[PDB]
Amino acid sequence: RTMSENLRRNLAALEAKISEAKTKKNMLQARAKAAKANAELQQTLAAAAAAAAAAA
């Protein structure tokens, strides 16, 4: 019965850090998707706007 209090806390502490890792996963993946889009948009627009205007 003393062991089962210890196991019931260890089981709750394990799912608590699994739960934490899952919320972190969503936020980290979101930042990676956003950063991919920011780089492509900024570089593509700046290059095209300089290039077409100068040629014309």
Next chain:
Amino acid sequence: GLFDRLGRVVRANLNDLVSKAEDPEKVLEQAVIDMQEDLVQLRQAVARTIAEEKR
């Protein structure tokens, strides 16, 4: 032994190339899926300790 160390290096080079081939973001969510079933294994064993305590 020397040939054990050399043997593990040729085997490790091929294994590391396969580890490079999969996307770390996909492998990280596979690791979370794997970690969720690891908690599924722990709850069955822990619950059986309650049954054994009651026995």
Next chain:
Amino acid sequence: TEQRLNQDTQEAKKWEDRAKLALTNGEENLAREALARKKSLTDTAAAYQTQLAQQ
């Protein structure tokens, strides 16, 4: 070309009034934006004055 000169010079007066409005409203960043529009209109007005002098 004299009509374009009157169009761009009255547009510069309009932007100067927008700059005055921005300064009384404390929005100095919008006053600089309006002054940038005013400058391109006064610089093209000098080009049209030069074209009109030739004509």
Next chain:
Amino acid sequence: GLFDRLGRVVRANLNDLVSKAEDPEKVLEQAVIDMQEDLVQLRQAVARTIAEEKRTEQRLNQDTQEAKKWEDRAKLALTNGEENLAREALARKKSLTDTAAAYQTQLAQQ
């Protein structure tokens, strides 16, 4: 060898005839077009050196904030009277500050 030199002469005579066939004025503007894309290749590589420079600066910030974390663990060990754990934390702090000086040196070169 003699046949290598003779071989390159028969091949060079045909190649020189093809070089005569194109107009030097058209080939000179093709060379300027080619030279403009050569600058396009250089800017991509140079910009990636800026990204790599910033990556070593990120590692420097990671290892220096990790050293501050370990210093806080050392402070906790000292208030808890566990001086043996304070020395363990200081050993982690030292390897992080010594590698931070290596990254500072790398960043200075970059």
Next chain:
Amino acid sequence: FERMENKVLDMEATSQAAGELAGFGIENQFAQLEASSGVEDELAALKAS
């Protein structure tokens, strides 16, 4: 988590990439110094009015 930390360094690298790309503007930047001082001079006159 370790492989995900390497992916976090892609965000750090992307931030420095935008900073290095912005650095191409430093020769032109003198125009921003004259523009900014000009707007503060007329704003000071507007505030004094």
